[PDB]
Amino acid sequence: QGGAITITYKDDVATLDPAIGYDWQNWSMIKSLFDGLMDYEPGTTNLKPDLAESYEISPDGKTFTFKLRHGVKFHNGREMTADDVKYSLDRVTNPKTQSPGAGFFGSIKGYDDVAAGKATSLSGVTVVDPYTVKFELTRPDATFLHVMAINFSHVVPKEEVEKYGADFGKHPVGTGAFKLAEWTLGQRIVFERNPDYWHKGLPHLDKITFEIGQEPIVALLRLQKGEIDVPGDGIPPAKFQEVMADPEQKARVVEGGQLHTGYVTMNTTMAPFDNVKVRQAVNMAINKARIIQIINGRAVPANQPLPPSMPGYDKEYKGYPYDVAKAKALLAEAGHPDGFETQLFAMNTDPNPRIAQAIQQDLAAIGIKASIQSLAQANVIAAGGDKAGAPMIWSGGMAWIADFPDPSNFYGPILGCAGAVPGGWNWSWYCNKDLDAKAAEADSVVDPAKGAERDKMWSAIYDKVMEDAPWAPVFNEQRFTMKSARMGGADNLYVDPVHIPINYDNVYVK
Ligand SMILES: [Ca+2]
DSSP states (O other): OOOEEEEEESSOOOOOOTTTOOSTTTHHHHHHHOOOSEEEOTTSOOEEESSEEEEEEOTTSOEEEEEEOSSOBOTTSOBOOHHHHHHHHHHHHSGGGOOTTGGGGTTBTTHHHHHTTSOSSOTTEEEEETTEEEEEBSSOOTTHHHHTTSGGGOOOOHHHHHHHGGGGGGSOOOSSSEEEEEEETTTEEEEEEOTTOSSTTOOOOSEEEEEESOOHHHHHHHHHTTSOSEETTOOOHHHHHHHHHOHHHHTTEEEEOOOBOEEEEEOTTSTTTTSHHHHHHHHTTOOHHHHHHHTTTOEEEOOSSSOTTSTTOOSSOOOOOOOHHHHHHHHHHTTOTTOEEEEEEEESSTTHHHHHHHHHHHHHHTTEEEEEEEEOHHHHHHHHTSTTSOSEEEOTTTOOBOSSSSGGGGTHHHHSGGGSSTTOSOTTOOOOHHHHHHHHHHHTOOOGGGHHHHHHHHHHHHHHHHHHOSEEEEEEEOEEEEOOTTEESOGGGTSOSSSOSOOTTTOEEO
16 A cells, blocks of 8 residues: 555667557556556466456457446546447558557457458457457467467557557557656656556555666675665666675575567568578577576576477477587578577666677687677667668567567567567568468467367477578576565565566555
């Protein structure tokens, strides 16, 4: 009940639009300003109705009917109704919105017509009455309920989108537990409790202040002084062991496993990375153990796209060897015995400039001279979302943590054709239509007793991805969160698997 906390970040926020935001800094911010039909029990991945009060599924699993809560108000005071759910889904799937999450809705009837520009409304989403919205699917979809909890299906008010247009992401209006109060660009973002939030008793805090442009190391000092509550950029490597060995700081640390993989993307449409042998050479060039030492051993080396604890992870897959001689030999086969020059993009928050320097040295060992383009995250992400931009990107600090705990989440948006779109997060621009179809087939296996078979279908998909080498996977990272002594709540609210980073709506001050 009450309290005003402070959270630091070095990088800035470019958007709070739920159709657009997708990075580690704004994902949970957006979840606190907006709501969708579904959410999760705080601290877990257990689905629960949110803006829906209840729902029904047809026996064939292709018709979802949601009964909406009554009396839900947007921050502007207007009642939310089923028309707003329809509008939001029509908007996020419309290609002109440039949502990196449009593909999550591919199983809805009429999606293809919308994606192809033949329709501006999803035929499969119908407003039955002001408080009933129905979804009809073309195929069973094992991740549909999770997608009705993902930011991209959060509900926006069309009159506010019309008012601000492309600038709606700077003026978010939602139904969520907090509303935007102050946004001083490059300096501070203030969330205030929404006093009329439909979920009574939430949030607990009165105010969250995000202080921008703050050095990660200084933030630890401020936390020791009680002048901030959460260092948003976590524990810098230079300070990790000292934090761990100081009981008065170790007591502020919460550690959690993640469904995470960090990787180097290669743009499969930009020469020279349009040659599979060049991409496989890069896979054999990276010294993952050395990179992991930079982050204090807080990770294990990744040999494939899925995190080791994700269902579908190929436990047997051997992977590309770390083998400079083989990498050079492959580069020569590809017509580059003398190597080549290229660009490696990275976000500029520690430790990612240093990790990029390590990758750069690894590439130099096989004859690739890569200049590091160390930029703000928004500009790395935008360059990735440009088919003609970013030959290589180190994903550290930006991607990928599963939005929901299923192997499908590591495909569509980052390795599927659905993500190889303007503004997308498939920075490899890797589009394999045959795998897209196999992915839809795998997500149609909905019988929970067939989960093992479905996990192996996904393993087969990622086996093929790995053969085409659009990624060089590097590591699977542990999460370390720091919180001030006054911050109450269970550990799993500070390493929340869904409201990534912190569950802003359910933490509290003691
Ligand atoms: Ca919410």
